[PDB]
Amino acid sequence: TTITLYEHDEKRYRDIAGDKKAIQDALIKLNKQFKKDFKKLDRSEDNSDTEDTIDESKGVVEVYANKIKARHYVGFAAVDNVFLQILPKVFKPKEDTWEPILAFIRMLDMAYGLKIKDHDLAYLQGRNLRPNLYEVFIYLFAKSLWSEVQRGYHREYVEVHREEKFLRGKLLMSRQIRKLPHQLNTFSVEVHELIEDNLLNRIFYASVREALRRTTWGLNRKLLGELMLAFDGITPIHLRTEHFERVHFTRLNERFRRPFELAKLLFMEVSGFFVDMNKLFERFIERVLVRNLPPEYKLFYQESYPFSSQKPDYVVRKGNTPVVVLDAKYRELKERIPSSDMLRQLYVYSRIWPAVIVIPSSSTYNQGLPDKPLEFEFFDERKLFIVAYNMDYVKTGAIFKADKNFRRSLNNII
Amino acid sequence: NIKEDYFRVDMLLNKKGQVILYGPPGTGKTWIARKYVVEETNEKTPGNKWEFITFHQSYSYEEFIEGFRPRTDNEEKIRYVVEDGIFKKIALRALVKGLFELEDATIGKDKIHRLYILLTKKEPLSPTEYEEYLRLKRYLWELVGGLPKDKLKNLTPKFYLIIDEINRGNISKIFGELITLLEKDKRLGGENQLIVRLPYSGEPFAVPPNLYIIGTMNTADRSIALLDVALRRRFAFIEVEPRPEFLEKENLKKIREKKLKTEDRKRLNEKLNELFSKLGNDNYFLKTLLEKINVRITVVKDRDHRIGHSYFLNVETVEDLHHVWYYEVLPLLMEYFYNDWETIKWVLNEKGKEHGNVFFEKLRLTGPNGEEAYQLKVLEGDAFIGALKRII
Amino acid sequence: KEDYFRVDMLLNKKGQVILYGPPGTGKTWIARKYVVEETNEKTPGNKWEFITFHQSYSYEEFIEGFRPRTDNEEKIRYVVEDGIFKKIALRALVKGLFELEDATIGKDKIHRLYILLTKKEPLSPTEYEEYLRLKRYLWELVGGLPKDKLKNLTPKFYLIIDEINRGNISKIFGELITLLEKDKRLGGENQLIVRLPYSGEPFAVPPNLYIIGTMNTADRSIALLDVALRRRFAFIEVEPRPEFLEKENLKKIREKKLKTEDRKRLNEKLNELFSKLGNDNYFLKTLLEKINVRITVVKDRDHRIGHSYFLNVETVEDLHHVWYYEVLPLLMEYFYNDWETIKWVLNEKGKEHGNVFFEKLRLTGPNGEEAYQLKVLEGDAFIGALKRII
Amino acid sequence: NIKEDYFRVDMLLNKKGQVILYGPPGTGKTWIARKYVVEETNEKTPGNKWEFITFHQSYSYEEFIEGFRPRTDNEEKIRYVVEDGIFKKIALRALVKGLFELEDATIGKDKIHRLYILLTKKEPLSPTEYEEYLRLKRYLWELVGGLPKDKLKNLTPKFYLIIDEINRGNISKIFGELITLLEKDKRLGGENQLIVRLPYSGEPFAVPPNLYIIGTMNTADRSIALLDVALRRRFAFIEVEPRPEFLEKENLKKIREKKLKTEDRKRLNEKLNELFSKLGNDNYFLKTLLEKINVRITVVKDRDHRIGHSYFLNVETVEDLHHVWYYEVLPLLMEYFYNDWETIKWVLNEKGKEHGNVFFEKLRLTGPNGEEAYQLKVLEGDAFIGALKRII
Ligand SMILES: Nc1nc2c(ncn2[C@@H]2O[C@H](COP(=O)(O)OP(=O)(O)OP(O)(O)=S)[C@@H](O)[C@H]2O)c(=O)[nH]1
Ligand SMILES: Nc1nc2c(ncn2[C@@H]2O[C@H](COP(=O)(O)OP(=O)(O)O)[C@@H](O)[C@H]2O)c(=O)[nH]1
Ligand SMILES: Nc1nc2c(ncn2[C@@H]2O[C@H](COP(=O)(O)OP(=O)(O)O)[C@@H](O)[C@H]2O)c(=O)[nH]1
Ligand SMILES: [Mg+2]
Ligand SMILES: [Mg+2]
Ligand SMILES: [Mg+2]
């Protein structure tokens, strides 16, 4: 069964496909698996409460008696033929669930640091496939591999001190001089032969073999079927985490960086990955600000310690003199005013940095939308200047029209 | 319609110089290449005018052109004389056999005929005549460089070389000196005559315009990720399609009677009439079965993974069709789809069927995470024919 | 018994077979018994030859290679000595030319070759140069004989190859792997008198020599072979039959090896065995069936538990040793870093810290792992843990 | 011929010392390396003035400049001697031929002539004269140590080493010592005369300024491409783009009658007039056909996988264009886009077409999970030109 969630959204167990007992068995393994692998991913003002909440089967999904509720952890996971995918709530609409997939991967393209191509994703737009995050990241792995295997096969050179019936390469002399004449019929050479089954090819044969076994499309089954035939002579391996560390990216296999990072993102039971929606917006806004703020340079994660260090998500300073704090919040900001938890942190970030502070918030049809300019000016009775900026999201499309509107509102703010 | 396939090879082999009969296995690519050379140069065996040679994964350049090899010398201790491979024993042979018919006033025809004897010698070279072989080979490449390009295009004996399974070996490593030479222009006598200096023996070497290197590439193994520049431009690729037109009643009768004898063709007529009467009196059954199963292969997987037509070409009864479907089609079908079951039953259009007359029946015990494993099921008699009559 | 009616059919329409199957099934024993029942040679040697493969096996020991040799306590003299495959292919040729009416022109010299080819350790070069002279006469003779005389050679020779998947089959056959197709052999339609690289004498597989492989496919599947092995050969799956482990079937199998007075002791011990198991004659049949049908749905079909391990049980203590040192080591080997699926193969999932073959360790780990540990049971408690596998 | 690709090789090879003609397959890279050296040295065969070798993956460092190679003497069969490769036999040949017209070798001009005989000797060196060869070699590197740099700047011959497919071998390993000699001011006579010490023989070695190295690498493959940044400085890369301008009506008559200067110029011209008259009297058809494929390959594939102008150069008739399409470049296009059918339909500009006069017909049978694949169609006649007029 395929189940899909948006951030802070619920599904009924009666309407859902499959079995009632089957889905709740899949989740308790996933929330437990998120507990052991929680510390690998960074957060930003998450209020995670690592001791109590995550180990109570509330790590990724809150499984309840009457419904199934998603926390603010975005991504996907495939467990026990119950494929779960959690999209952001910002891309929620009012092919009907194919626009938020390419919106989320493009927000996973710019924020998280991936180097995927837009024409890789635009190939899938309109082919009426079943929307699934695991079916597209296997495709993004398989297409970027088959576009990097079609040119060259990555045959890397190792040297072997082999006793050959012929003579290839440099003849070892200290091993041939001390050769008895009863065994003179084989040369003892040290040939730098190119092997096809290197460590990077043992991984990509194993990463395809664990992908074709767990794929469900008709496009990925054809593409991984051609990749497995190209890797036919390679002896297979069992994938571990030691194999993904033992290879290093030099200049002669640098073009295999794009399929390998996606092969490390999906393989290392469980499959997939999860990230916090607060930090992914904190990373995504950081791409927008430094591009859109020419007058003043901006650094993310600068920290100033009170008295326990409370650090802004981003601060922009021209040289050192202007202190314009920019704290990225994923909150909906209901009733056109910041909440108690938000404005209390905005007060501290301005005071310990005469410092204006701007809060960027999400804006679409689903999320709360303010007017086009800088919506809310606030003073906290200390000559402060709190500006509520809102970035519109044309990221569901491929054109960046809202970046010009975000620059025009920031130019009036700067 | 096989003389056009002996003309499709023949029109490309005088224009590009060498071909590759690429196609799915069980088609006749080895048989078309072998029965074209035997029909052209009337020599039923290898050796003199053509040499059959297959490739493998551990085949190296030193076995093909030349390499240092230990060789015994008159039942005594070994020496380390450099041995010419299987190509250089026929590339030099195609030169010195063509240089008989050339009437020039500089040919050492007594010396060239002595070199031709030492090249066709089936025994290995003894050191009393190996130095006579290397000295006469030195006279050959002093003579070839002195002949003009006008007298090195019309060499009469067409030498051949059936490279079987050319994609199985590493093609760019075997053809070391033969991905700069195997063009029609880079041969001897052409406009771009190149005599390439070899690394091991140190003597210059150039392919003559007689040698045509026919290749028979299986493409269900070590697929189309080829060299794509060197081993793809030189070879004029001929697709040998798996033709189900040879699987009718008359076409199976015509194939198995021409190679047959007097008493064999009457028994092959009685056997094939018994076979197709058990199938439903369908004279076009095995054609329609192979054509239907080939369309399902080219839709799901690649178009060059189709089941060929050399398998069903040697059937005479239902029991022989059973032993070619369960040992040369269904193990071959489970090889292409990498032990998949939900798409291997759509090829037989048995996607929504289980436990009946199906070639892959579902086991009635699912796994822990809801997975299911199918199992091959042997059939017999009219149950198997009813399992074949719903593939169409 | 019934597999010998399948190998005998497939060895005529293909020419070679590979008996693949899970380890401890009968793959070596079916290949050995079929050849002995066909050629009535209880020992290897004359009409058949047994050979294993390994990772560092060579072309020099299979077909033809160089080997040193002393000449009356002198310096090392290198001589070309034929391997296993060429000594059984030339033997299948010179034995087949006895019953040919056209090969009677050299019947004395061909018979001299067959006596020389079945004897061991040719000690002097005076018969070796006689041997190389007779072999050149043999290939000069069969090169000028018609295809009708060389299609039906009477005495069939066999080559039982053990562990066909282990050897580097693209190296140890070399460029001779295209001599195994039935239309590519000697006396076929497209025959090939191909030349060997070392000694230069020609070589061709006669149509007597059938290649009965044997493939332990617990490590390497049939799709993971070399590409010139899944099409030249023809695969017979020797499935693990649990029907050889009944009360009457285990008695009939053990009745062939022992004597008459040993049989009554064998009858009394098997009556003592199955009475302790709960008076179930169908017990060891349904034990492997309830294991293998749970093995083949969580792993491949080629990872099952065979039936040669349970063919020597006489008491419960012997079955205690077989289940703990010969079968459960295989299940821990096939399921590494995975304790849940092996707990479902035994269908003991959710039951820990009792009469369980893998008890749960109390400790959890740094991040939290299950990390079970096997438990050696004994006595009636072991049968109480084996009864609930059924 | 002398306009661009000749005058920019000769200017750049005289300035840098080494030229690599990198470019996609089907372009005149081997040809412009062969034509430039033969038109310079006036020797249409290898040997004395120039040597044409080619690299591969079985090529050794020990067989290039220096290595231990076991020779076969008479009474001692296994004798391990150090044998100079092909580069040390062309670098020493370029040195001792250039040192015939010097004025500081006045004691050993007979010794330099005797050393030049031993290097031009194609016979294998007997061990009675190999020590005479080694005594003259260590006399040579004593003589250039006493030679001034003003007299080693101008050596009047011009020796060449056309290595072909340089990028195939392990170029960091083959050029062992040559990764620090191959520069214009690091040869003999340059501003930094470097005489390095070879490992095996222990004799010093330095590339003369007489030598030039014209590599022709291929850049369609990527796993063998030359990314050694310390080696790309030594060479001087010349991109030979595949020019479709050699496929016009006037250009095919000027390229094919320059080489074939026989009396068949009236035969080629009336055949090339008949070929373009069947193409709609379009004198720029094959120029437009190769241009509208190479641009459409550049945008989706890499820019170095383009179709060259050596496929369509040897066309004569529509029947010959049909042979070079369906057997050379259409299996090439199915290799670039291997079961990527929406791309290969678009490269031939048949994206919306799925029936009729088209190369790839759509199958009328879709798959289980919504996949769909196409099928070739062997066209002929004016319908084939109607399928080529849609590309341009
Ligand atoms: N006259 C003439 N012929 C050309 C020209 N360019 C290419 N050719 C022809 O192309 C043919 C082969 O081109 P070639 O240079 O050998 O390709 P290549 O460099 O070897 O291709 P690769 O496989 O190594 S990558 C030759 O027959 C030559 O006549 C040209 O500019 N003028
Ligand atoms: N008579 C006849 N036999 C054919 C034809 N095509 C194939 N065969 C048969 O196919 C068999 C050879 O198959 P082969 O070429 O080895 O298949 P492949 O090399 O794996 O592609 C021979 O036994 C032939 O009898 C044909 O056109 N005519
Ligand atoms: N009597 C008898 N013994 C069998 C049978 N099947 C297997 N065996 C035994 O199984 C053993 C052979 O196992 P083997 O095939 O070599 O296992 P492998 O290692 O996978 O090849 C022999 O010692 C036989 O005693 C059978 O049907 N009857
Ligand atoms: Mg073949
Ligand atoms: Mg065995
Ligand atoms: Mg070239």
Side-chain angles (χ1 to χ4, degrees), chain B residues 29-31 164-165 216 218, chain C residues 181 184 232:
Chain B
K29 331 183 302 303
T30 312
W31 187 84
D164 200 331
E165 292 181 350
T216 78
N218 296 309
Chain C
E181 311 199 61
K184 277 278 184 305
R232 268 85 185 182

Side-chain angles (χ1 to χ4, degrees), chain B residues 255-256 258-259 262 264-267 269 271-286:
Chain B
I255 282 174
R256 302 202 59 198
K258 177 249 191 203
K259 316 282 189 332
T262 56
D264 189 90
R265 52 152 284 188
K266 42 189 91 193
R267 286 305 81 89
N269 183 218
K271 273 298 188 66
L272 284 177
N273 284 139
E274 179 71 346
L275 161 65
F276 284 103
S277 158
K278 289 206 61 183
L279 298 161
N281 224 327
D282 261 8
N283 278 255
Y284 295 158
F285 177 74
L286 283 180

